[PDB]
Amino acid sequence: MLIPVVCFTCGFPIGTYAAIFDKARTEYIKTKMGGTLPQNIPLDASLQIELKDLITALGIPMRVCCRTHLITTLDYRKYY
Amino acid sequence: NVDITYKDQRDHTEIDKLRESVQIQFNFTDVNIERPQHRNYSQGNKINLLPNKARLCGLSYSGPVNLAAEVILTAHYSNGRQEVKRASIPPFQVSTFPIMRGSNRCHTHHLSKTAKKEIGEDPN
Amino acid sequence: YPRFALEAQAYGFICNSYIAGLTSPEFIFGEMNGRFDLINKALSTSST
Amino acid sequence: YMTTGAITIEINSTKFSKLRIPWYLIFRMFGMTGDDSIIEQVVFDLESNSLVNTFMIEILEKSIHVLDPIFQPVQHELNREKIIQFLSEKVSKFVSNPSAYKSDENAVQYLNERQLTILDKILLPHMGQTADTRVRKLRFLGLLIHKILLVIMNVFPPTDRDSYRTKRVHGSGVSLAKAFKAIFNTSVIAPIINGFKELLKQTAFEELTQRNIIEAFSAALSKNTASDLNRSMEQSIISG
Amino acid sequence: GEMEDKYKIFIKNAPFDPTNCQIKKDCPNCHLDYLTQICIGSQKIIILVCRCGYMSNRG
Amino acid sequence: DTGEKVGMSKQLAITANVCTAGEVLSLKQRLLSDPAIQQLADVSNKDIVRKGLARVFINGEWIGCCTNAFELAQRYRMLRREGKVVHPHTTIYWDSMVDEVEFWLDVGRLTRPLLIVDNNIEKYNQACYKAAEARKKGDKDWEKHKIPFIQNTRFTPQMAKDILAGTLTLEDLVAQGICEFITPEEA
Numbered sequence: 001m002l003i004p005v006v007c008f009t010c011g012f013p014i015g016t017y018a019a020i021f022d023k024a025r026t027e028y029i030k031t032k033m034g035g036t037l038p039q040n041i042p043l044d045a046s047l048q049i050e051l052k053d054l055i056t057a058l059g060i061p062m063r064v065c066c067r068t069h070l071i072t073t074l075d076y077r078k079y080y
Numbered sequence: 081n082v083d084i085t086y087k088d089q090r091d092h093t094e095i096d097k098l099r100e101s102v103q104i105q106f107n108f109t110d111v112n113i114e115r116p117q118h119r120n121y122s123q124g125n126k127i128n129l130l131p132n133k134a135r136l137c138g139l140s141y142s143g144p145v146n147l148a149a150e151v152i153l154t155a156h157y158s159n160g161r162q163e164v165k166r167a168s169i170p171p172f173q174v175s176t177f178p179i180m181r182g183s184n185r186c187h188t189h190h191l192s193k194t195a196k197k198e199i200g201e202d203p204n
Numbered sequence: 205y206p207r208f209a210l211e212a213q214a215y216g217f218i219c220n221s222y223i224a225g226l227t228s229p230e231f232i233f234g235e236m237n238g239r240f241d242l243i244n245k246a247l248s249t250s251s252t
Numbered sequence: 253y254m255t256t257g258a259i260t261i262e263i264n265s266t267k268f269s270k271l272r273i274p275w276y277l278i279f280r281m282f283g284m285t286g287d288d289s290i291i292e293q294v295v296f297d298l299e300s301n302s303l304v305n306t307f308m309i310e311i312l313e314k315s316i317h318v319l320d321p322i323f324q325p326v327q328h329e330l331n332r333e334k335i336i337q338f339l340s341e342k343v344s345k346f347v348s349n350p351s352a353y354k355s356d357e358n359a360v361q362y363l364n365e366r367q368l369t370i371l372d373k374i375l376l377p378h379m380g381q382t383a384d385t386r387v388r389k390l391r392f393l394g395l396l397i398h399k400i401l402l403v404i405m406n407v408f409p410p411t412d413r414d415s416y417r418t419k420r421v422h423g424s425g426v427s428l429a430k431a432f433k434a435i436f437n438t439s440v441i442a443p444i445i446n447g448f449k450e451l452l453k454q455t456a457f458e459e460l461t462q463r464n465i466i467e468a469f470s471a472a473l474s475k476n477t478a479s480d481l482n483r484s485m486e487q488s489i490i491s492g
Numbered sequence: 493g494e495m496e497d498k499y500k501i502f503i504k505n506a507p508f509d510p511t512n513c514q515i516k517k518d519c520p521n522c523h524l525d526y527l528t529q530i531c532i533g534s535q536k537i538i539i540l541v542c543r544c545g546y547m548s549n550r551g
Numbered sequence: 552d553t554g555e556k557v558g559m560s561k562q563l564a565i566t567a568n569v570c571t572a573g574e575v576l577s578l579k580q581r582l583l584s585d586p587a588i589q590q591l592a593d594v595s596n597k598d599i600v601r602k603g604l605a606r607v608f609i610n611g612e613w614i615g616c617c618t619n620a621f622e623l624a625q626r627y628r629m630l631r632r633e634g635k636v637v638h639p640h641t642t643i644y645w646d647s648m649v650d651e652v653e654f655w656l657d658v659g660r661l662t663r664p665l666l667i668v669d670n671n672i673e674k675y676n677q678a679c680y681k682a683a684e685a686r687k688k689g690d691k692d693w694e695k696h697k698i699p700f701i702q703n704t705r706f707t708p709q710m711a712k713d714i715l716a717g718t719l720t721l722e723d724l725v726a727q728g729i730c731e732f733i734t735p736e737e738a
């Protein structure tokens with residue numbers, strides 16, 4: 001229901017940066033879109049923004065697993 | 081619109097011996113459907129039955145149906161003369177018909193995503 | 205495909221490999237072929 | 253269509269039960285008796301001498317010369333009314349005492365009118381239910397026979413039982429209605445009939461007033477009817 | 493046989509059915525660039541029909 | 552995938568819907584009013600096989616005969632694209648093998664929207680005709696009167712962008728004749 005405390009695969013503490021990563025990510029996407037209605041922002045276009053440098057700025061390594069689970073984990077607070 | 085004839089077999093008076101059969105005829109006048117309701121057990125009216133309440137209590141999410149009718153009968157004698165009677169029935173709760181979830185007859189039609197989420201329904 | 209089509213594609217010739225990706229007509233023909241094998245495998249239990 | 257050559261018609265419905273009538277009698281009851289007109293009701297022409305039309309008249313001419321055990325004395329009959337009379341002789345379930353209602357005049361007309369109106373509504377009801385639509389019901393039934401003989405002809409394939417140009421998907425509303433009514437038949441009007449039966453069996457009808465009509469109507473619709481109807485409707489939905 | 497009544501209606505309607513196979517071949521009657529090809533029967537008889545009424549095999 | 556249930560429980564495709572029942576009476580009273588239809592009681596079987604008239608069914612029942620079945624079916628198809636005279640969910644089938652027209656507006660018809668392809672076949676045909684006129688008359692450069700054939704859909708990238716932006720709907724595409732609903736009968 002949230003980004004996990006640790007990476008499911010290796011156990012790196014990805015959760016200690018999860019909250020920040022969420023909020024920062026949102027702001028970052030609002031920079032790349034240019035002030036659009038939340039529905040007029042298509043879902044497929046919000047996912048094509050590269051989050052590589054943002055995750056690196058969080059101090060997270062270049063591990064495939066950690067970034068997979070950080071980027072793709074669904075938050076329940078946005079579905080209910 | 082039912083219309084049939086049945087042979088009568090009452091043989092006590094002379095006036096009974098003057099008759100042949102009874103012509104049955106009747107129809108229904110006004111039909112309407114209201115939302116599902118519940119009793120709450122206080123000797124009162126019917127209160128709204130929410131879907132989760134029916135899920136939990138093992139009830140049925142059925143709304144009562146209201147019908148009106150007209151019953152007009154004919155009486156046939158031996159000679160060939162007839163006696164016609166008429167009767168009017170006001171709106172009358174016939175039975176409860178099941179209600180589909182999310183339809184016009186459902187309570188979660190006037191209720192939005194927040195309202196569905198608040199009472200114990202799936203908002204999506 | 206039009207009526208009385210003479211091209212080989214109209215009757216189930218697939219020019220694409222799986223790694224290249226089939227098209228809609230080729231996927232349908234391959235779906236027709238695959239469904240036959242499932243049905244015959246369903247007759248495997250009952251008939252014998 | 254049979255191996256011998258007879259072309260027959262069965263009308264499955266509530267009133268009747270799987271009776272098969274040769275393809276000429278249905279046409280003759282409706283006012284079209286001449287054989288040339290009837291062969292123009294299926295082949296649509298008598299002046300085209302091609303393979304299809306020659307073989308069509310061959311099959312249909314051979315069809316009308318078979319002796320069905322049920323329609324022997326009504327095989328070459330000339331008019332409509334006595335054909336309908338024999339129809340009543342056959343299908344009338346409540347008539348089991350022949351040679352008696354024929355001694356009077358009114359019963360013949362009553363049976364003829366009843367069998368005229370039922371077959372006016374029970375045959376091809378999508379074309380109408382009044383007498384003015386009977387004539388074109390003849391033409392449409394002829395067209396159906398023609399289409400069937402074209403498949404006998406090996407000219408067109410039979411109907412594909414799996415293509416979706418001849419399928420429909422109904423769903424909740426239609427099935428719920430047709431089950432709300434199929435069980436309405438047993439638990440409502442039959443109880444009303446029986447309640448009126450037992451009200452007439454006890455209380456004098458010339459003494460019966462409106463109050464007792466209301467009493468009997470609300471008695472025949474007591475909790476047994478409402479219970480049985482809804483229980484059978486839910487049992488039908490859950491049983492499959 | 494065929495081409496005569498088993499498919500006469502279909503053949504006459506062929507130049508108008510949009511789902512029929514067209515052939516890049518000139519027409520003699522109306523000098524049209526394309527014709528409609530139909531392959532009927534188990535002998536696979538080929539007929540080139542045109543909207544102008546042209547028909548091969550003397551039709 | 553296993554057992555006797557294979558091929559028994561089917562699933563709708565992503566764009567497939569099921570049609571409700573349309574107003575059959577409006578279309579029927581429109582058809583009987585159409586001058587290009589001879590009424591069923593106003594024509595006989597001999598007439599319809601002599602001239603070869605084509606019969607017009609609506610929702611199952613036969614309601615007259617037309618002279619040119621293809622022309623009637625395509626004119627009603629063109630009316631269905633305007634959306635005012637014929638309802639967009641009307642099935643208009645034309646059996647060219649037996650030469651009959653069928654209109655359907657009942658319940659249970661699977662439909663899906665399909666983008667409509669147009670072309671300039673009429674301009675191509677007149678160009679071919681004038682090229683033939685110059686061909687037999689003796690012009691050595693007759694073939695520069697011919698025009699290329701063009702077939703295309705009217706769906707543009709801007710319409711896709713607006714669908715993603717929510718400013719365009721399917722009912723707006725049907726309304727301006729870009730897509731139309733097709734049934735397995737009409738397909």
Ligand SMILES: [Zn+2]
Pocket residue numbers: 007008009010011012063064065066067
């Ligand atoms: Zn990891």
Ligand SMILES: [Zn+2]
Pocket residue numbers: 519520521522523524542543544545546
């Ligand atoms: Zn031509």
